[PDB]
């Protein structure tokens, strides 16, 4: 006798043809018509916000099967949607003792998408793991999308705060990035990329509220070292590392205040915890009336506003908490007055704390390393109790050709970097807005003016005094959350060894 096993297989694979006559099965979306009319379908986010009309009668809810635990005549399903999860209970004493229904439910693979008809109620002791403290008691359950393939790893493992406690399964970065579409379902990763969207929104709205316009400038360039080359119709072209030339040309056109949110591309063969070959740059360029520090304080206000808005309200607080659950770090700290140090002051601080050793002969040409900048971050965290500060007045020889120098001390420039947790997030400067000084500085840097003619020519019919800055988006998010690797805040990271997915 083997027809018993084939009948069981029929049960596991059961396709429901009428959801009015049946209580379980795989269903086509077209067949989901209850009493020839539309179903009022809820998602778990609506349920969470309403509860933490849904309690009067049976409701319909869709979600992904996060977990199923079979326990004889009971089965417990965790449904998941975004950051929200809810326990649903199948108890076949309440389902006409249909053993086939239980068998079919127990066989459902994790991550399958189901529509459940059931009644909500609040248990005595609610499940700690679900942030919805109600449970659905299942009357019907239909699967509209069945998981077709064994998962590359378990979400229970991918969600775990990483530990050495015996029996811990780590999912390593390579496996996660290789199966990114599964990795992104962890609660922390979903929350990270909502926070990324939030930073974009806050940035744009702050600038728009201050009378900026958004611009979009080309990434295919006729001229750029550390740039990807392309064949552009038998011309040789390059990918933009920055929209720097075009945003200045817009200021020279009278646009006054511009920003861009757009990809940039870097071809350095660098494999580190923080370098990406492709990332999103937030770029600002704007005029000033008489002092470029007018703009510096503006950019400072911008970041303080970003910090304030990320740390405020229910939604952002929950997103940050959810990240922290898997990746704990102390909350980001900033002051009402942002500390500003000159480069010379920062050097002298590092020498005073015994982190740096230079002759006075060498202090002019010294180019601060990235580790040294982290040491400054530690010093300033200890003395000023902040994770955010500003360095100004870098030596001119260490900054790009378009940086305006001080006319009293030409060796010193009107430049600035902002730091979060000891790492640079923003770089910018007052720009040379005199076409003749600009030509002089381009020759001073041994650059080819013929490859910059269009840019140079935008200064030849007057130029407003202006300044600007460029910001790494993924890096700001990484440093705000204290995450250990830039690949955690870029959706599909690009690095010299990763072109896929």
Residues labelled as active-site residues? 266, 268, 274-275, 424, 427, 475
- Beta carbon nearer to a second copy, 115 or 387: 115
Residue written as token pair 């811990």: 168
Structure tokens at 160: 């775990």
Report in angstroms how near the CB of residue 145 gets to a second copy at its nearest.
4
Where does this chain touch a second copy (CB under 8 A) — which range of 126-134, 148-156, 349-357, 386-394? 148-156
Q: Write out the DSSP string of 353-408.
A: TTS----TTTTTT----HHHHHHHHHHHHHHH--SEEEEE--BGGGS-TTBPBPSS
Where does this chain touch a second copy (CB under 8 A) — which range of 1-9, 70-78, 230-238, 409-417? 230-238
**Using rule CB under 8 A, residue 221 touches a second copy:** yes
Report in angstroms how near the CB of residue 148 gets to a second copy at its nearest.
5
Report in angstroms how near the CB of residue 56 gets to a second copy at its nearest.
21
Q: Which helix (H) or strand (E) holds 74?
A: strand 74-81
Report in angstroms how near the CB of residue 120 gets to a second copy at its nearest.
19
**Using rule CB under 8 A, residue 261 touches a second copy:** yes
**Using rule CB under 8 A, residue 455 touches a second copy:** yes
- Beta carbon nearer to a second copy, 107 or 383: 107
The CA distance from 204 to 257, in Å, is 12
Restricted to residues 410-429, the positions that interact with a second copy (CB under 8 A) are none
**Is residue 253 within 8 Å of residue 458, measured between CB atoms?**
yes
CB neighbour list of residue 82: distance below 8 Å, 6 or more residues apart: 44, 45, 190
Report in angstroms how near the CB of residue 451 gets to a second copy at its nearest.
10
**Is residue 155 within 8 Å of residue 112, measured between CB atoms?**
no
Per the DSSP assignment, residues forming a β-bridge with 34 are 37
DSSP state of 286: E
Restricted to residues 267-286, the positions that interact with a second copy (CB under 8 A) are 267, 269, 277-278, 280
Restricted to residues 88-117, the positions that interact with a second copy (CB under 8 A) are 111-113
Separation of first and last alpha carbons in the chain? 49
Query: Which one of residues 4, 35, 72, 290 is an interface residue with a second copy (CB under 8 A)?
Result: 290
Query: Which one of residues 76, 327, 401, 464 is an interface residue with a second copy (CB under 8 A)?
Result: 464
Restricted to residues 167-206, the positions that interact with a second copy (CB under 8 A) are 179-182, 184-185, 190, 193-194, 196-197, 200-201, 204
**Using rule CB under 8 A, residue 382 touches a second copy:** no
- Beta carbon nearer to a second copy, 123 or 263: 263
Q: Which helix (H) or strand (E) holds 119?
A: strand 113-121
Pairing of strands 415-420, 257-265: unpaired
Report in angstroms how near the CB of residue 116 gets to a second copy at its nearest.
14
**Using rule CB under 8 A, residue 66 touches a second copy:** no
**Using rule CB under 8 A, residue 130 touches a second copy:** no
**Is residue 347 within 8 Å of residue 226, measured between CB atoms?**
no
Restricted to residues 469-498, the positions that interact with a second copy (CB under 8 A) are 473, 490-492, 494, 496-497
**Using rule CB under 8 A, residue 465 touches a second copy:** yes
Report in angstroms how near the CB of residue 338 gets to a second copy at its nearest.
22
Report in angstroms how near the CB of residue 157 gets to a second copy at its nearest.
15
Query: Which one of residues 229, 301, 352, 369 is an interface residue with a second copy (CB under 8 A)?
Result: 229
The CA distance from 422 to 351, in Å, is 17
**Using rule CB under 8 A, residue 209 touches a second copy:** no
> Could you give phi then psi for residue 111, rounded to 5 degrees?
75, -5
Task: State the CB neighbour count (10 A cutoff) for residue 435.
Answer: 17
- Beta carbon nearer to a second copy, 101 or 438: 438
Q: Write out the DSSP string of 307-351.
A: HHHHT-SHHHHHHHHHHHHHS--PPP---SS--EEEHHHHHHHHH
Restricted to residues 315-374, the positions that interact with a second copy (CB under 8 A) are none
Rg of the chain over Cα atoms, rounded to whole angstroms, equals: 29
The CA distance from 181 to 81, in Å, is 15
Q: Which helix (H) or strand (E) holds 84?
A: strand 84-91
Structure tokens at 52: 């933490």
**Using rule CB under 8 A, residue 218 touches a second copy:** yes
Where does this chain touch a second copy (CB under 8 A) — which range of 8-16, 39-47, 361-369, 376-384? 39-47
> Measured between alpha carbons, how far is residue 443 from residues 276, 455, 457 in Å?
31, 15, 15
- Beta carbon nearer to a second copy, 350 or 475: 475
Report in angstroms how near the CB of residue 239 gets to a second copy at its nearest.
7
Q: Which of 49, 447, 433, 477 is nearest to 276 (CA)?
A: 477
The SS3 of residue 479 is helix
- Beta carbon nearer to a second copy, 396 or 490: 490
**Is residue 91 within 8 Å of residue 135, measured between CB atoms?**
no
**Using rule CB under 8 A, residue 55 touches a second copy:** no
**Using rule CB under 8 A, residue 463 touches a second copy:** yes
**Is residue 121 within 8 Å of residue 51, measured between CB atoms?**
no
What is the per-residue binding string for a second copy in 383-402, x denoting contact by CB under 8 A? Answer: --------------------
**Using rule CB under 8 A, residue 232 touches a second copy:** yes
């Amino acid at each position: 006798r083997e027809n018993l096993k084939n009948e069981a297989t029929k049960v596991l694979e059961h396709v429901c043809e009428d959801i009015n006559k049946e209580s379980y099965g795989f269903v086509k979306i077209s067949k989901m018509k209850e009493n020839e009319k539309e179903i009022r379908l809820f998602n778990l986010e609506e349920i969470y916000h309403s509860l933490m009309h849904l309690l009067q009668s049976d409701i319909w809810v869709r979600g992904r099967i996060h977990d199923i635990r079979s326990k004889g005549s009971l089965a417990f399903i965790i449904l998941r949607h975004k950051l929200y999860s809810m326990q649903c209970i199948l108890d076949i004493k309440h389902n006409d003792n249909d053993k086939n229904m239980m068998k079919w439910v127990s066989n459902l693979p994790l991550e399958s998408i189901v529509d459940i008809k059931g009644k909500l109620s609040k248990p005595e002791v609610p499940i700690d793991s679900t942030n919805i403290k109600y449970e659905a008691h299942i009357r019907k359950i239909f699967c509209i999308s069945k998981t077709a393939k064994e998962l590359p790893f378990l979400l229970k493992d991918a969600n775990m705060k990483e530990t050495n406690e015996e029996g811990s399964i780590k999912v390593n970065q390579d496996n996660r990035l290789n199966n990114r579409c599964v990795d992104l379902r962890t609660y922390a990763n979903y929350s990270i990329f909502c926070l990324q969207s939030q930073i974009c929104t806050i940035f744009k709205n702050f600038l728009l509220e201050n009378n900026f316009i958004e611009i979009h400038t080309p990434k295919l360039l006729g001229e750029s070292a550390n740039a990807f080359q392309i064949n552009y119709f038998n011309q040789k072209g390059f990918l933009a590392q920055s929209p720097q030339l075009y945003k200045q040309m817009c200021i020279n056109s009278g646009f006054d205040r511009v920003f861009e949110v757009a990809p940039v591309f870097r071809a350095e063969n660098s494999n580190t915890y923080r370098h990406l070959c492709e990332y999103v740059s937030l770029d600002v360029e704007m005029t000033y009336k008489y002092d470029y520090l007018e703009n510096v304080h503006f950019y400072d206000s911008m970041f303080k506003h970003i910090f304030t808005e990320l740390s405020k309200g229910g939604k952002n607080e929950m997103l940050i908490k959810t990240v922290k659950g898997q990746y704990p770090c102390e909350d980001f700290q900033w002051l009402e007055e942002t500390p500003i140090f000159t480069y010379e002051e920062a050097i002298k601080m590092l020498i005073q704390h015994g982190k740096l050793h230079l002759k006075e002969e060498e202090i002019l040409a010294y180019d601060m390393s990235t580790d040294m900048e982290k040491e400054l971050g530690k010093i300033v965290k200890a003395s000023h109790h902040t994770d955010y500060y500003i360095i100004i007045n870098f030596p001119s020889a260490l900054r790009p050709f378009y940086t305006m120098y001080k006319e009293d001390e030409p060796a010193i420039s009107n430049s600035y970097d902002f730091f979060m947790r000891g790492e640079e997030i923003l770089s910018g400067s007052q720009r040379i807005s005199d076409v003749n000084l600009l030509l002089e500085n381009i020759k001073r840097f041994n650059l080819d003016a013929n490859k910059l003619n269009f840019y140079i020519d935008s200064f030849a019919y007057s130029s407003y005094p202006h300044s600007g800055c460029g910001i790494g988006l993924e890096r700001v998010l990484m440093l705000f959350l204290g995450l250990n690797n830039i690949r955690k805040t870029s959706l599909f990271p690009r690095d010299p060894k990763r072109l896929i997915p």
